Symmetry: D2
Subunit: 391 residues, 4 copies
């Protein structure tokens, strides 16, 4: 058996929509986190065989931004690079695909994760035919290609309404979970628990460079009362609000992967061994249930029981879906998203899966957790999961 | 682990703004997915995952690979995703599918590529807002598909770079394009694309139209018409519209499973995937990609170049193709025997799966044992895959 | 009492939408008509004091296309020029306004009319504030700024339906009117009656200049059957169709104005004397009724009865409204649009008023008619009318 | 011997580019000024015969914004309305065109002036032919149709440079003039001298209506040093800067006109009698010189010497051109733009001619000036001037 380790890992801070990284291309965020994982493992950019980056919204950024991030990071031209899209699942899925490159003896050293600038996503129109007369639409690729179900034509937040109703999750319960996520994240932030995983990013300016190293979407002093004033965002008699869904965000996150024996030759003390992974499909109307079969198949492939897990990162696309997954799987909620989740931290789609992986790993190192699981729901009706054991 | 291609299908390749001018990529993908199932005799319910290369998905909606999958009747339980190694994507996707199976994560994979260059939109980033002055609406087909991100120029400039390096004449590159057209017109007329093509039905308001012929192939291609063309990228250049491939639409896929599985199902596979490899090269000379990628593929298969019976080497430009032939030194008679991308067209994310199909089906026809498929990639890469027949 | 004459007049052929003049800016057409009126009067460009050109759709054409047209035509930089917009009324209203320049002693020689390139009208969006997220429309300025009612939000065609209903005008009556417009226009064209009024226009090419001197929108051999098969274009239970409405078209048309005393000094035999004009408002919902009060008011001011008129040009925006106007005024339809109207000839919005003035003046001359009237309905609920007498 | 008076007048505050009126359609600003002139004169909306509004940048605003403005202000559907465009000349030219409707007996009561939203001007492109392949430009219509010379291809600011070189006007002279304009405007705003002319405009807001009644573009405490450090904006070795040019601005301004005998019957004390007006062309290259022949011609027509004038408003498109006009005319600079000019106040193009008329009229009344003149330069090479005497 192969045995592949996460040697090192790093993420930018998650930026607020049209905020800190409002004008920063995904691959620039990418390059920073690629350099990061190299430096942190003590491996030279010249040793990297291939870079694999999940990205959902790459229109107008030019040819293969995975290669632009690779090349900017100083990964030599001789290496290879590609992007991929399994939507919200992409940044964790890229990690599993890198693992496979090594397992099959096609690569020795892989940098894998994801990057997203939802800010820099353009508006678009098909205009070759040419428009003889009449208005036409300029389509927001963020919304069209990121947030709109292709089969049912509505937003992801409507899929969360479907799950809410399915599981009979109240507005109060979904708000209670949001305020708890914000509080957990504000606590971890203040306590320095995100410092290890975050690599600062320098936004180059005209009248000044600006170093970003703090998650800017977390709201300080989140109360239940403010949560409860909000209006439903997708259904007028609905439960889901801007306050209990994640936001629109920018960021990047990566992991350096190699064989267990290679990390040992190099004196590297890996963050984890990738024990299993699994991806599964579900009905798109209730895509927020994805993590349930994916996490169960992952655990099955680890040969692990749910109760064996010491720490979980289960992405918070919406408080409605997150509460459902927790309810179903039954794992102790106190070991879930201990430093808060995507409602607080944000949801830079193609990067999210590597973002939460980062957060799991560094917290597993911090508390001395042995066994961890990362899981995400996926628009169009999928889920992805990964099991990690500490060395 | 021994992973075979059970079956393969591709759409005909359309001309830019032509047969598929208003057909979303994923509808071309779905036809190709259903065709691989049907040809193998495998139920859609049995597919674990669909992996589709695609370079130009803007505005087509969430995860068009999943859209293709669902429209093809693959149940909601399966998974799907897209990937982009530019022109390698459609072949790389097949290596990626093979890997899912070789690591025991999946049993049956459909893999390939899909591209509508015609449906690629224009775009601009407009959230900041344009306070004053003119701005550009960007052709994502050009920006995201054909322009080098490091040097800022069109792929055809990289093909010029290779032409100067390998001292390839305008006559030589024209000779290669006329030769590719003649081969592809002969093949077409001879019925040699029939097997590999699945017809696609363009749904219309005043009539459905069935597309089952590659419409970019030009009939009666003469050196004269080639020799009159003006260079397309350098005013003192050698690259033209006629000795470069085109902008095109299409899909192409393969059904992958283990060799033991194929035999349990009584399926006579198109080939066993013996190796593959991808390597990087200077972006400036990206057309050279197939050189290191086919040597590494050949070294991983444990084959010599002389062992190959048939080769598909994608013709992005006459100059890069001639260059790769010259260095690898394989018999040009066994290379793109039914023509190439110059004649056939070059639907970016689909090309690698396109040339795979041609190779597989021609191998079966003429009874070749060992084949190789390879492509150059924008940004400076190569991908290659070694196939042996059962 | 000041007396102003129309010394000379000319118009381009009226181009089909995206047809002969598809890529010709409105001011190039205008310049040709300016040159033509000068040459027909025996007046030099040096002598013009001001150019006044109606134009509804100048977006993207640059600073003040009226000045562009004047300068191209050799009118000296010491002259002045300006555009105006009273929608369909514009090309006729420009004439009245140029008569007023002379009447108040501010100018001696005016060129006035209108020009329009519906073909070259752009699509637009307000983008300065930025579009933070979600789709936006690229608006067709031709439809938005030319053809849509600003108050009720519907197309001019809907105002036509409102008039069809009010006056109980059958589909059969409108279609017959439309077929009669085509057939009269075709006859006039074939017999050479548009030759005098038309100045040929040279579309400069690349692989060859093309001279345009024939109205291209006129359908030859128009049948009642073909009119009858068309579907209503604005209201699914409607009566107004593409066939019994005017079209989208390009063209220019002008008049050279001076005092009666000045024409006499120059030895010019003028096309006519401007005896009166008028403009009046009506309800936007039935804008097609504008010509009713405008004509009555114009006639009152001239001291004429409806029965005094020898020829009439009443613009055919739509068969419904044309029929309503004829019914209410009660003038002999055999003297109205004797050479066809806009259903056949086309409707280059800002040019149309001076286009039907041209047609009226050259027909008055041909047939020896002493008294004429030109009138148009106007988007937003107005009418304009002018009374002309022969010298 | 017709004598037309200005019965009442009003303007909005002039907003900054994308400032107070950033999302306010021009006709909304026009409607408030229409209402204000009516209330100020004691004339009812029912009595208005026509509304005439200069406007250069109406693209995307829909059919005939002048009619939109009128209708909004409650001017009856039976009145008429139209827009016109002689660039910077427009708002003043409309007042002359308004005068002429009364003089020729075609109307009794006119509201005339101008309105402009430079902020709301869209970007556009001609897309009907259709873009086969490649990038294309979205054109800024405010720059294209408002600010760029159609003959020479360069900005109005280059024409200012040409005037600077011809009249040898230093950077120090232009900057001193600019600072003076700011400091005069600031003192006037502070002392309340814009109150009488300004009608407050209510900007309707989701989370609050905002009343705008102060000119927001005037810089308070403007320093010479601030002006001196700017880089030339149009030529690298040039002299014209963003500081000694006018701005991009939004606003509206109008005058209610009637015969002198009519104002007498109603007991209205008019703001002034329109004694004369003129418009003349110059070389487009030196368009800022337009006020010179236009003001001389206007004075000739009034039978006045330059020395008879008690107050002048000479629009400050650029310091360079304002200086050249003042030098050539030789009028006492202490009677010119007494309360500041467009450098400070701003330049909402189609409204500007009416804006400066408002300032002249209310300052004439305040100080008891008997004889006044308003003039502006005009893109494409023209000037317009009007003479006003007090009753
Ligand atoms: C009415 C209008 C919307 C129709 O535009 P359109 O549908 O794009 O024009 P088309 O020519 O394609 O009309 C559809 C059909 O009518 C047919 N046609 C028009 N008149 C016909 C007639 N005389 N007999 C037979 N066919 C006729 C065309 O051949 C066409 O056929 P197709 O569908 O096969 O191409 C457009 O002309 C319009 O907005 N005009 C009104 C303009 C206006 O209101 N001007 C301002 C005045 S207030
Ligand atoms: C001149 C022009 C091109 C400048 O464009 P701009 O760069 O977008 O204008 P900005 O305000 O952003 O830039 C001017 C700078 O000088 C400063 N500035 C402006 N006026 C100033 C003054 N009076 N004193 C000191 N500084 C001043 C501003 O603060 C700004 O500095 P900043 O960017 O650090 O904030 C533009 O205003 C213009 O086209 N105006 C001319 C209008 C015209 O031609 N009208 C028609 C006449 S025919």
């Amino acid at each position: 058996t192969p045995s592949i380790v996460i040697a090192s890992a790093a993420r930018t801070a998650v930026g607020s929509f049209n905020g800190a990284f409002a004008n920063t291309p995904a691959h620039e965020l990418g390059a920073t986190v690629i350099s990061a994982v190299l430096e942190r493992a003590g491996v030279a950019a010249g040793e990297v065989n291939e870079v694999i980056l999940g990205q959902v919204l790459p229109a107008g950024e030019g040819q293969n931004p995975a290669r632009q991030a690779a090349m900017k990071a100083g990964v030599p031209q001789e290496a290879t690079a590609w992007g991929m899209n399994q939507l919200c699942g992409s940044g964790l899925r890229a990690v599993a695909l890198g693992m496979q490159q090594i397992a099959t003896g096609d690569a020795s050293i892989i940098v894998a994760g994801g990057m997203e600038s939802m800010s820099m996503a353009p508006h678009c129109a098909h205009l070759r035919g040419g428009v003889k007369m009449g208005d036409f639409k300029m389509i927001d690729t963020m919304i069209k290609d990121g947030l709109t179900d292709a089969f049912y034509g509505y937003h992801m937040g409507t899929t969360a309404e479907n799950v809410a109703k399915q599981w009979q999750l109240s507005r109060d319960e979904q708000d209670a979970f949001a305020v708890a996520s914000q509080n957990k994240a504000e606590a971890a932030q203040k306590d320095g628990r995100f410092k290890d995983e975050i690599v600062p990013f320098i936004v180059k300016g005209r009248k000044g460079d600006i170093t970003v190293d703090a998650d800017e979407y977390i709201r300080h002093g989140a109360t239940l009362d403010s949560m409860a004033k909000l209006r439903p965002a997708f259904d007028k008699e609905g439960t889901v609000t801007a306050g209990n869904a994640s936001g629109l965000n920018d960021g990047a996150a990566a992991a350096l992967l190699m064989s267990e024996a290679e990390a040992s030759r190099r004196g590297i003390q890996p963050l984890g061994r990738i024990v299993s992974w699994a991806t599964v499909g579900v009905d798109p109307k209730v895509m927020g249930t994805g993590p349930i079969p994916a996490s169960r198949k992952a655990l099955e492939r680890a040969g692990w029981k749910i109760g064996d897990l010491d720490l979980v990162e289960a992405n918070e696309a919406f408080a409605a879906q997150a509460c459902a997954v927790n309810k179903d799987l039954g794992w102790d909620p106190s070991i879930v998203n201990v430093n808060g989740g995507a409602i607080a931290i944000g949801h830079p789609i193609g990067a999210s899966g590597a973002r939460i992986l980062n957060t799991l790993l560094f917290e597993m190192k911090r508390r001395g957790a042995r066994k961890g699981l990362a899981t995400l729901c996926i628009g169009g009706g999928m889920g992805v999961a990964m099991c990690i054991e500490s060395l």
